[PDB]
Structure formats: C-alpha cells, structure tokens
C-alpha cells in the first residue's frame, strides 16, 4: 500500500515564462488512474488546478484553461503539468495527489514551489 509522490519542476520565472511540473509515483501499491495537481497560494485555500483520469479525461481550473497542459509519461507512473504563459497569480506551492476510494488521499507532501515575479 505504500506510495511516494515525488513532486518536482517548480522554479522562479518571469511573467510569460514556462515550467514543467513532474509528479513521479513509486511504491508497492497506489491508484494512479486519477492524478490531480493542486496549489495553495499564501494564506489561501488549496484548489484543484488540473486533473487527468484514464488517458484522456482532463480538467483545468478556469484560471489556467488554455495555458496549462496535463499529461502522462509513456513508460513510467509519472504525470506532468506543462505550465505556459505564466502569470504572477500562478505563484503558489503545487502538490500532486491521487484518489483513495471516493476522495482525494490524505497525502500532502513538500510539493514544489512556483514563483512568477515581474
């Protein structure tokens, strides 16, 4: 049952820049059929930014529609979040997560920091 979700790819960029986040899963067992990227800005509520279920059922929050793209690695249990046309309001710590039964799992790790600064 143990899973580790290694989050990486964040960074400090200027407005209009790009980053690719990586959620790399490993462990004896985990449900990787649904993967969500969440973010929490300072003093703000965590929000689901993007989700992929199966190979091709995707969700994007209104504020990132058209700018972010979620995808799977072809050979590994990894999911990517390509973030293009970055804005200052995308600054947050980004976390990836999976379902456990009928809810997002209680995993809430270190995440990866995204800073977009003029």
């Amino acid at each position: 049952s143990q899973v580790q979700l290694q989050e990486s790819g964040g960074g400090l960029v200027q407005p209009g820049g790009s980053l690719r986040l990586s959620c790399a899963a490993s462990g004896s067992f985990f449900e990787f059929g649904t993967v969500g990227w969440f973010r929490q800005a300072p003093g703000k509520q965590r929000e689901l930014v993007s989700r992929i279920t199966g190979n091709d059922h995707r969700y994007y929050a209104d504020s990132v529609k058209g700018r972010f793209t979620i995808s799977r690695d072809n050979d590994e249990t990894t999911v990517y979040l390509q973030m293009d046309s970055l804005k200052p309001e995308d600054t947050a710590i980004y976390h990836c997560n999976i379902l456990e039964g009928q809810r997002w799992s209680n995993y809430w790790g270190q995440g990866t920091q995204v800073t977009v600064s003029a």
């Binding site: 067992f29 649904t34 989700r51």
Partner: peptide, 29 residues
C-alpha cells in the same frame, strides 16, 4: 456533487469527475 455544496462546474473537494481508471501494472497482485 458529493456534499451539499453545489459544484457550479468546479472540481475539488466534494465535487468529483465520476469515473476512475484502473491502473493495471503487470506487477499488481
């Protein structure tokens, strides 16, 4: 809509896409 708060098209806690995918890996039990 998993709770009493309406989703208004926004996914998140208590607002779920209704399908899950199996993640069949060859090493599964």
């Amino acid at each position: 809509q998993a709770g009493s708060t309406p989703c208004n098209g926004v996914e998140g806690f208590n607002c779920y896409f209704p399908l899950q995918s199996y993640g069949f890996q060859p090493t599964n039990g």
